[PDB]
Design an enzyme around this catalytic site. Structure first.
Site, PDB file in Angstrom:
ATOM      1  N   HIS A  10      11.403  -4.061  -5.597  1.00  0.00           N
ATOM      2  CA  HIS A  10      11.582  -3.781  -7.021  1.00  0.00           C
ATOM      3  C   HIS A  10      12.981  -4.086  -7.523  1.00  0.00           C
ATOM      4  O   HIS A  10      13.833  -4.558  -6.764  1.00  0.00           O
ATOM      5  CB  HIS A  10      11.079  -2.362  -7.394  1.00  0.00           C
ATOM      6  CG  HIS A  10       9.695  -2.119  -6.895  1.00  0.00           C
ATOM      7  ND1 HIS A  10       8.575  -2.555  -7.613  1.00  0.00           N
ATOM      8  CD2 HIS A  10       9.290  -1.589  -5.715  1.00  0.00           C
ATOM      9  CE1 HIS A  10       7.524  -2.251  -6.863  1.00  0.00           C
ATOM     10  NE2 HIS A  10       7.897  -1.654  -5.709  1.00  0.00           N
ATOM     11  N   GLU A  45      11.520   4.584  -6.866  1.00  0.00           N
ATOM     12  CA  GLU A  45      11.309   3.737  -5.695  1.00  0.00           C
ATOM     13  C   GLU A  45      12.419   2.692  -5.567  1.00  0.00           C
ATOM     14  O   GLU A  45      12.943   2.472  -4.475  1.00  0.00           O
ATOM     15  CB  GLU A  45       9.947   3.034  -5.795  1.00  0.00           C
ATOM     16  CG  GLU A  45       9.660   2.134  -4.586  1.00  0.00           C
ATOM     17  CD  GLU A  45       8.350   1.382  -4.688  1.00  0.00           C
ATOM     18  OE1 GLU A  45       7.607   1.627  -5.666  1.00  0.00           O
ATOM     19  OE2 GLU A  45       8.077   0.531  -3.803  1.00  0.00           O
ATOM     20  N   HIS A 100       9.486  -0.701   0.710  1.00  0.00           N
ATOM     21  CA  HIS A 100       8.808  -0.140  -0.441  1.00  0.00           C
ATOM     22  C   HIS A 100       8.456   1.328  -0.162  1.00  0.00           C
ATOM     23  O   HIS A 100       8.623   1.802   0.954  1.00  0.00           O
ATOM     24  CB  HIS A 100       7.517  -0.955  -0.696  1.00  0.00           C
ATOM     25  CG  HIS A 100       7.736  -2.225  -1.458  1.00  0.00           C
ATOM     26  ND1 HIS A 100       7.461  -2.317  -2.818  1.00  0.00           N
ATOM     27  CD2 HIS A 100       8.183  -3.427  -1.016  1.00  0.00           C
ATOM     28  CE1 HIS A 100       7.785  -3.554  -3.164  1.00  0.00           C
ATOM     29  NE2 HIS A 100       8.245  -4.255  -2.105  1.00  0.00           N
ATOM     30  N   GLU A 175       5.785   0.066   3.795  1.00  0.00           N
ATOM     31  CA  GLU A 175       5.674   1.179   2.848  1.00  0.00           C
ATOM     32  C   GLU A 175       6.100   2.408   3.657  1.00  0.00           C
ATOM     33  O   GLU A 175       5.383   2.843   4.566  1.00  0.00           O
ATOM     34  CB  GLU A 175       4.235   1.332   2.352  1.00  0.00           C
ATOM     35  CG  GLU A 175       3.856   0.221   1.396  1.00  0.00           C
ATOM     36  CD  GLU A 175       4.407   0.380  -0.005  1.00  0.00           C
ATOM     37  OE1 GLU A 175       5.069   1.410  -0.277  1.00  0.00           O
ATOM     38  OE2 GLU A 175       4.127  -0.503  -0.849  1.00  0.00           O
TER      39      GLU A 175
END
Ligand SMILES: [Cl-]
Ligand SMILES: [Cl-]
Ligand SMILES: [Cl-]
Ligand SMILES: [Cl-]
Ligand SMILES: [Pt+2]
Ligand SMILES: [Pt+2]
Ligand SMILES: [Pt+2]
Ligand SMILES: [Zn+2]
Length: 213
Positions: A10, A45, A100, A175
């Site tokens: 991101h 995040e 992530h 993740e």
């Protein structure tokens, strides 16, 4: 000799351009970027992946590994998912690791390591699957449980992630946990928790690098 590309998932900030369509690597397109999720307290995040990414960079630099980052800050627009993959490929790295955190059901806890499947090249078919398995074993070793809500025993072979599809070099997308879960969010919101994730990540990267040489 070793080069690792670290991708803190991101952007530091988003604008309307994140909706622009980019190639997936399998035909069709998807959005350039996604905002990402956040904990219930509002810890985003993008900041978690950036802070954990910096710790991983510090750990790899301690091993004399040359590192590259997909972005250089946590406060401005960052590159699209296709640009991050093309940037990584241009460096011919020994390993690519994307960080992530998920936005799942409150009781969903733990990690999953994503890899490209079905594979689009020999690297995706073999080395990247070995790297994903090594990383899964390392996160479980730092006491991070395998996700109880997604994947299979902490792994997720999948075709829908552009960054994984476009990789020509060993690449995985981790993740680390579910930001909506009390246990995972408490780790993510703490400097000691972020260091714990970075320790598992460096062990996974080093383990894989030691098998390729
Ligand atoms: Cl090939
Ligand atoms: Cl397995
Ligand atoms: Cl994607
Ligand atoms: Cl992606
Ligand atoms: Pt080295
Ligand atoms: Pt770039
Ligand atoms: Pt993606
Ligand atoms: Zn994400």
């Amino acid at each position: 000799g070793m080069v690792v590309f670290i991708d803190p998932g991101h952007n530091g900030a988003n604008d309307a351009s994140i909706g622009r369509q980019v190639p997936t690597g399998r035909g069709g397109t998807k959005n350039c970027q996604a905002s990402g999720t956040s904990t219930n307290s509002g810890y985003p995040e993008h900041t978690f992946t950036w802070e954990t990414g910096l710790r991983l960079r510090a750990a790899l630099n301690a091993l004399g590994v040359r590192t590259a980052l997909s972005r250089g800050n946590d406060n401005a627009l960052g590159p699209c998912v296709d640009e991050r993959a093309n940037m990584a490929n241009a460096l011919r790295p020994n390993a690519i690791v994307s960080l992530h955190a998920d936005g799942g059901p409150a009781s969903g806890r733990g990690f999953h390591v994503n890899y490209s499947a079905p594979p689009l090249n020999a690297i995706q078919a073999g080395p990247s699957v070995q790297f994903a398995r090594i990383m899964r074993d390392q996160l479980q070793a730092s006491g991070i449980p395998k996700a109880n809500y997604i994947g299979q025993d902490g792994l997720y072979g999948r075709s829908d992630l552009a960054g994984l599809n476009l990789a020509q070099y060993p690449s995985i997308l981790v993740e680390l946990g579910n930001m909506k879960n009390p246990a995972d969010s408490a780790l993510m919101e703490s400097a000691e928790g972020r260091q714990k994730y970075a320790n598992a990540l460096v062990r996974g990267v080093a383990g894989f690098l030691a098998t390729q040489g």
